[PDB]
XYZ file of C-alpha atoms in Angstrom:
31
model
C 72.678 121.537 48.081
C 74.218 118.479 49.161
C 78.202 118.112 48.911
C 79.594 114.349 50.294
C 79.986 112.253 53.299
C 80.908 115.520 55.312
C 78.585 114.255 58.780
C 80.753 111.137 57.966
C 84.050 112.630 59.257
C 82.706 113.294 62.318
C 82.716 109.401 63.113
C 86.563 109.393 62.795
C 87.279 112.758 63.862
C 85.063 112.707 67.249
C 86.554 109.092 68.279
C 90.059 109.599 67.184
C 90.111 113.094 69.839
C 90.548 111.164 72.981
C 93.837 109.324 71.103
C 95.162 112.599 69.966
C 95.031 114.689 73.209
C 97.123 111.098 74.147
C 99.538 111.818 71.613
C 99.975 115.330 72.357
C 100.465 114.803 75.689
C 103.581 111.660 74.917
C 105.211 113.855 72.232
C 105.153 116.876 74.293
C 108.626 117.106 75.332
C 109.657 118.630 78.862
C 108.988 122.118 79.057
């Protein structure tokens, strides 16, 4: 029933959003 860890990602997936919507938004060239 049980596989791993997989709630686990969510602790360095949720807080790591806000720093990739800033990345997107840097490395988006003009357009």
């Amino acid at each position: 029933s049980g596989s791993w860890l997989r709630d686990i990602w969510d602790w360095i997936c949720e807080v790591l959003s806000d720093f990739k919507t800033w990345l997107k938004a840097k490395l988006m060239p003009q357009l």
